[PDB]
DNA sequence: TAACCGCCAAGGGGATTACTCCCTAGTCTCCAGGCACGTGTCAGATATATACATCGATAACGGCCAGTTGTGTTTGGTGTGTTTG
């Protein structure tokens, strides 16, 4: 899921690809057209 | 008493003869034997060749070591300013 070379994994975005949940076919529709914005985990702001 | 000597006798058979048969020494030819080669075969010795074995060298295979987003504070120095010596 690191979407990066091997070498500087950790500089690169995480999570870009994820395992699908397979556990009930309204799961694996959700999964399939998700989204997910970049900021920062748990950023202090709440406008985005 | 019979070996020997003497007179007597018949005729056997040894030597010779004319003549005849066919024998055998001899010749050219050509077989039987025998000792020499000729081709062939088996057995052996010398030689070339394939194969397995010991030993030596390279080097493939094993394995090690090497380098290859944000908030809230502090401190510490520079420039300006005022007063002092």
New binding site residues.
């Given amino acids: 899921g690191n979407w990066g070379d091997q070498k500087k994994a950790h500089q690169a975005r995480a999570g870009v690809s994820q395992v699908l949940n397979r556990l009930t076919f309204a799961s694996t529709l959700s999964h399939l057209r998700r989204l997910n914005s970049?900021?920062?985990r748990?950023?202090?702001?709440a406008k985005p």
Wanted: no cysteine; hydrophobic share 30%; glycine share 28%.
């Fill in positions: 970049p900021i920062g748990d950023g202090k702001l």
